[PDB]
């Protein structure tokens, strides 16, 4: 329904403008759920105020936290022309922070 519009996280209301939105979704191995990776500049996304590496919480009012890419990509196209994306900032959230590894040779 309409219980709760905005709260802790930021509401990113996307509005179809040119061909495809200004964001891109991708599935990462090991991780559960989809999120924004490519945020086109001065585009539909960058305009809505949606940052990258933001774990999806719900689309058009449909929790996608543990939703498969297929479920989302389909919910977005079906949604119609506009959609409501809700995610958290990359800084606010917390990811697996550890001594990253570089290139190995030998």
From Swiss-Prot:
Tissues with expression: Expression is limited to epithelial cells. Expressed in the kidney (brush border of proximal tubule), pancreas, liver, and small intestine. Expressed at a lower level in the adrenal cortex, testis and stomach. Overexpressed in breast, renal and lung carcinomas.
Record's subcellular location: Membrane; Cell membrane
Ranges in a coiled coil: none
Positions of modified residues (Phosphoserine): 24, 68
Regions crossing the membrane: none
Domain PDZ: 10-91
Assembly with partners or alone: Interacts with PDZK1IP1 and ABCC2. Interacts (via PDZ domains 1 and 3) with SCARB1 (C-terminal domain). Forms a heterodimeric complex with NHERF1. Interacts with AKAP2, BCR, CFTR, SLC22A12, SLC22A4, SLC22A5, NHERF2 and SLC17A1. Component of a complex, composed of PDZK1, SYNGAP1, KLHL17 and NMDA receptors. Interacts (via PDZ1 domain) directly with KLHL17; the interaction is important for integrity of actin cytoskeleton structures in neurons. Interacts (via the first PDZ domain) with PTGIR (via non-isoprenylated C-terminus).
Purpose of the protein: A scaffold protein that connects plasma membrane proteins and regulatory components, regulating their surface expression in epithelial cells apical domains. May be involved in the coordination of a diverse range of regulatory processes for ion transport and second messenger cascades. In complex with NHERF1, may cluster proteins that are functionally dependent in a mutual fashion and modulate the trafficking and the activity of the associated membrane proteins. May play a role in the cellular mechanisms associated with multidrug resistance through its interaction with ABCC2 and PDZK1IP1.
Record comment regarding domains: The PDZ 2 and 3 domains seem to be involved in the interaction with SLC26A3. Interaction with the C-terminus of CFTR could be mediated through independent binding of PDZ 1, 3 and 4 domains.
Family under the similarity heading: Belongs to the NHER family.
Protein's name in the database: Na(+)/H(+) exchange regulatory cofactor NHE-RF3
Name of the coding gene: PDZK1
